[PDB]
Design a protein around this nucleic acid. Sequence first.
RNA 1: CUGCAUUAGCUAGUUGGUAAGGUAACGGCUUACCAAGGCAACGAUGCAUAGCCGACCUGAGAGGGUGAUCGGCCACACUGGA
RNA 2: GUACCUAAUCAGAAAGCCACGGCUAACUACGUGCCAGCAGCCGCGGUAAUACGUAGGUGGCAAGCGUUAUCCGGAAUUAUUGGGCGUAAAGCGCGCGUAGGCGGUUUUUUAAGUCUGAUGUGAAAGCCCACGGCUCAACCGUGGAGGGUCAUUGGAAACUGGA
RNA 3: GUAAACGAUGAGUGCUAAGUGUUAGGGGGCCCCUUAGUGCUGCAGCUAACGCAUUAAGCACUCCGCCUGGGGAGUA
RNA 4: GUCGAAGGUGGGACAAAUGAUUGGGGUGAAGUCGUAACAAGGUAGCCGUAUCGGAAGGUGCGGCUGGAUC
Lengths: 80, 199, 135, 131, 156
Amino acid sequence: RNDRKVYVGKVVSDKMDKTITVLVETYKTHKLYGKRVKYSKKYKTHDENNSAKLGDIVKIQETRPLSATKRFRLVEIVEE
Amino acid sequence: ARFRGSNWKKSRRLGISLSGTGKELEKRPYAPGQHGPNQRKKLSEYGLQLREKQKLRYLYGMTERQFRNTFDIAGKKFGVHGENFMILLASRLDAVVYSLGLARTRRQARQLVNHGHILVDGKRVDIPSYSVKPGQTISVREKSQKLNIIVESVEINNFVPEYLNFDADSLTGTFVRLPERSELPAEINEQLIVEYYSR
Amino acid sequence: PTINQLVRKPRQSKIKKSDSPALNKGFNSKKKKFTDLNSPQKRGVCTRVGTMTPKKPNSALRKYARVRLSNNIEINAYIPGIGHNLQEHSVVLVRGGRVKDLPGVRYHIVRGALDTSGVDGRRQGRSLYGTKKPK
Amino acid sequence: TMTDPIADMLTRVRNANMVRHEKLELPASNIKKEIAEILKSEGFIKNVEYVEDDKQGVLRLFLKYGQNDERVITGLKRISKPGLRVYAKASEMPKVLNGLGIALVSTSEGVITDKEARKRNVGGEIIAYVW
Amino acid sequence: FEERVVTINRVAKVVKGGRRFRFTALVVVGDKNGRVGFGTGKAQEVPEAIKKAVEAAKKDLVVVPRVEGTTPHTITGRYGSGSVFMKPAAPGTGVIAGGPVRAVLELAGITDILSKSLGSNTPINMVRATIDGLQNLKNAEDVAKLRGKTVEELYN
RNA sequence: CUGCAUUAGCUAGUUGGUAAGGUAACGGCUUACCAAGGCAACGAUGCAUAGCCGACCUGAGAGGGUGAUCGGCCACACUGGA
RNA sequence: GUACCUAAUCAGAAAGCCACGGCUAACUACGUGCCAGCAGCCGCGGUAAUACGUAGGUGGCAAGCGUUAUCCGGAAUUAUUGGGCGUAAAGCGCGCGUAGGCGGUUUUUUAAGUCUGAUGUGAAAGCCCACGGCUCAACCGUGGAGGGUCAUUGGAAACUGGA
RNA sequence: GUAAACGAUGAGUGCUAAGUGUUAGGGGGCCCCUUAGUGCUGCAGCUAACGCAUUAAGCACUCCGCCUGGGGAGUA
RNA sequence: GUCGAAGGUGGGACAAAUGAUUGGGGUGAAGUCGUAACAAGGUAGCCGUAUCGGAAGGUGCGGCUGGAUC
Ligand SMILES: [Mg+2]
Ligand SMILES: [Mg+2]
Ligand SMILES: [Mg+2]
Ligand SMILES: [Mg+2]
Ligand SMILES: [Mg+2]
Ligand SMILES: [Mg+2]
Ligand SMILES: [Mg+2]
Ligand SMILES: [Mg+2]
Ligand SMILES: [Mg+2]
Ligand SMILES: [Mg+2]
Ligand SMILES: [Mg+2]
Ligand SMILES: [Mg+2]
């Protein structure tokens, strides 16, 4: 089986129902200067049991579109 | 040819005998025209570079476009650019025919090739710009074997460079190998020409 | 600047202005809008033809014409050569090139194109002044 | 505050070299000792001594001055910096002064010169150029 | 020694009567075999200024390290606001340099070089910058001696 | 993979959930119901401009400029809707 | 009945354009006289103009040569490579501080950055290199080489990051 | 909420000849050593020059603010 | 019957053109008035501010030397 992409980030919003927003931080090198700059993307993730809470590190895997904006699911909670 | 003007005036201007005999420079070794006899001011660095380029160009009777294209392809090769340019100029069917001695003049050799008298590897080549490579045999067309011009030129035992190998009996030459800078004209400072094309 | 400053705020090149703005605009009649297109020459109609006094220290009467171009921009175009046939309502080709003496003239009239006649008796640099070979 | 201890080391060497001091002392670190050892190995500096101090240690470098007091080290430059880190692949390793100078490179095989890096086919962070 | 007149300048000193003019000459001197010099001379007449410059240039001659008609390593010669980058080139490259730099490099016997004037274009400061660069040029033998290594050890 | 902050707020099917309908198909895709979310100085929203790319022009290079011909992808077919 | 080939006849039908004070290769005469004009810039022209116009001569190119428009270069004049801020343009009047950027020494560990491989992919055409076909060349064909900030997977661990 | 608000010189850190005065200390024999200020003089180095020079405008690393011909205009 | 192109009506937004008149700017006669700055520029100059005057400018207050003879 081909593998879906997996990301690790911190939950920044738990307000929505059965949903958590996970901020994934990556570095983008400047094309000219060459310095890496911190960049963040919020990924809307499915949390069926409303298990996760703001401030917990989480592992998310890509899925089929589960909503208008939700494309990922919560694999596990790495830290709390 | 292509340039068909006064070869003497061009020799006198460039301070070099294009015929290779000095007949142009014997009586009046100074630039042509009204102000020729009067003193000539010193050439600028650009003036010297241009002079050297024009010397080589008019020696081989080439147009500027073709001269510059030849300079480029020479540059793309391996070794010293200037030398490669000069050997590549010498490898022209024009120059090869002249140096074999099938004609007494470079323009004559050019007309011979251009009018279809010359054979390369048994087949007719009519482009004076044709680039002869080592191992190729230059010959005269079977019909043109008895041309007064060719026979008379061959009778005049012109010195044949070492990189060529001519048989006057058969009117057949062979491009044995690439020329050497030693064998090429000594009046040309190719470095100036490289510099000219640098800027 | 520091590298962090260069990343936060990039280096910015100076934009340049055309010396010949009127040639770089077109007009659409149907949409009634100006079009941005680069043109080497433009046709125009001479609103006025007269002489101008050059900026000091130069002194002369310089021949010029005010031309309404096809894009509808009014400009002052210099008339080169000795003598001209141009009058008001003449149709002319205008190219780029400013006259340094004349303050407002940023264009030249092309000689020997459309209505503009070639300079008569020009025998050197005829192509510049629209004169045919004399022979 | 102090942001680049390596750059400080190279500047101390540069400053002492300008005034033709025989020796210089600096606060020690494992990287700075390794840099010093390469400089002695390449013949840029005479000697390196380490003194335990109960803090971070002290490195003592003895500088080399040729006959006529000609300086063996002409120049030193920090390449990779805290502000902008510089790395090279083994293929892309730079030559300093056409091989007359050296580049000190931090590689997974240790802190080494550019020549060793090309030989071992291991790239890394370019710490400095010394010529 | 070959001599090339880089620039001639008419300079003026103002007096009560008016301006008094003299001519200044900058001349490069070289044997075309690794020794080059520069000198300036001032006189009422250009020939006399040239002559004084030649004598000055001969007094100060700098030895230039050359590796087969090129420089040993890349160098940027800097003097005042004058800056000249010089990079060694392969044979047949020719002298790629502009104005004063060309005169200095040619008379030093360098036939192949890549150069760019990065600073002032004032002739004297360009020349001084060029000379500075050549003075800071080093040869492998000397570097090896200074570093107590063989030339082979220098290159590994 | 684009400019502009003399454009700083934006959004209410909007953000999520539940159920149903609908589609080749996942899905606010749609509709009721429930909750108040979602986006934004890491530039949202607005305004201007533009088909995109393989390439092409220039430059020692790093870069800068451009997107004819040919090939790929997209969009359009008097205008708008079905 | 095209290409090509052969034979016969004929130098006969086949050179123009710009420039020549400096940059920038190439100067004289005559006319004109701050006029007429020239001009990219410095400028030139008011009576002995190598700068205007023409002529002779020369220079640069050539079935082209010039002009205009536009882009890159030269321009290190947005400077990562590769500039600066006492007096030239440029240090906020000065604190307190938030985000961000950056950060002392040692050990252990990890392996995100970093380094080193493998695999897949980055169409073809093009560029580049080589070879081959066209009388040559342009052009055409073929094979390499190159092109990711790429993905996946195996190692190394000094430095940066994490613990 | 602005001044020629000036050292027309951002802040932090380290390094690089000396001589001399002065302010508040510390230490050891009037002298010597030392810490933090405040002046003058002066190498190396730097600078277009003037000058700066352990109170850098020297040699370095970090971060911030600012500049890119003059006028129009600090205007609309 | 729902949805629905076009069309109609309404209050706003933005952009461009034009408008009696008016404001400062620029350029151009060897125009008119004075002489403010550059020397101790004949009251050192300049900076911020306030006020006054045909005009440059004057004066007050604070500041700077990028001034100050003997
Ligand atoms: Mg469009
Ligand atoms: Mg460049
Ligand atoms: Mg003309
Ligand atoms: Mg540039
Ligand atoms: Mg200033
Ligand atoms: Mg301050
Ligand atoms: Mg391809
Ligand atoms: Mg202020
Ligand atoms: Mg003190
Ligand atoms: Mg006064
Ligand atoms: Mg006064
Ligand atoms: Mg009063």
